[PDB]
Amino acid sequence: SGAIYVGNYRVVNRHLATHNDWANLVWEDSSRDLLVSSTTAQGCDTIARCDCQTGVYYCSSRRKHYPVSFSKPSLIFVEASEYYPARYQSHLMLAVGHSEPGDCGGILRCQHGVVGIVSTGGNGLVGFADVRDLLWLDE
Ligand SMILES: COc1ncccc1NC(=O)N1CCC[C@H](C(N)=O)C1
Numbered sequence: 001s002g003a004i005y006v007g008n009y010r011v012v013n014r015h016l017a018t019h020n021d022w023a024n025l026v027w028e029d030s031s032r033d034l035l036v037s038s039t040t041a042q043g044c045d046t047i048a049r050c051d052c053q054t055g056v057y058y059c060s061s062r063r064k065h066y067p068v069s070f071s072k073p074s075l076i077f078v079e080a081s082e083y084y085p086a087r088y089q090s091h092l093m094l095a096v097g098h099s100e101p102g103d104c105g106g107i108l109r110c111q112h113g114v115v116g117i118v119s120t121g122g123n124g125l126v127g128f129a130d131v132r133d134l135l136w137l138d139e
C-alpha cells in the first residue's frame, strides 16, 4: 500500500484504488497501473522533474529503504495477475531489489522529489511506475 499526496491530488496504484478514489477520479491509466483522485486537504509531497536513474525506495515487506539504480521509463511485459491480464505496462522502470505484492505503493525518491511508486516485481526485481512526466500534478 501507499500513495503520493501532491496539491489536491492523491496518486495510487490503479489496482489498489478504493471506492473513494473512483468516486473522486481525476485520471486513470490501466496500461501504467496509475490512478489519481482529488482530495480536500493539501498534500505533503513534491514531484521530481529530472532524469535521475538512481534513488531510494521504501520496501514495506522489510520495513526498510533501499538504494536502487533503475532503467528509464519503458514498455515492459508483465505476467498475468488477479488484477490484470498478461500485458505490456508502459512508463515502467526496473531495478534489482526486493519486493512482494503488498509492497505496491512504496515511494521511490531521488534528491529532487518523488519519482514514482512500486508497481511490479519478482525474483529480485522491482518495478516502479514513473510519475515525472505528469506535469499537471503540480498545477
Ligand atoms: C511488487 O509486486 C510484486 N512483487 C513481487 C512478486 C509479485 C509482485 N506482483 C506484481 O508484480 N503484480 C501484482 C499486482 C499488479 C502488478 C501490475 N502492475 O501489473 C503485478
Ligand SMILES: [Zn+2]
Residues within 6 Å of the ligand: 048, 049, 050, 051, 052, 110, 111, 112, 113
Ligand atoms: Zn532527480
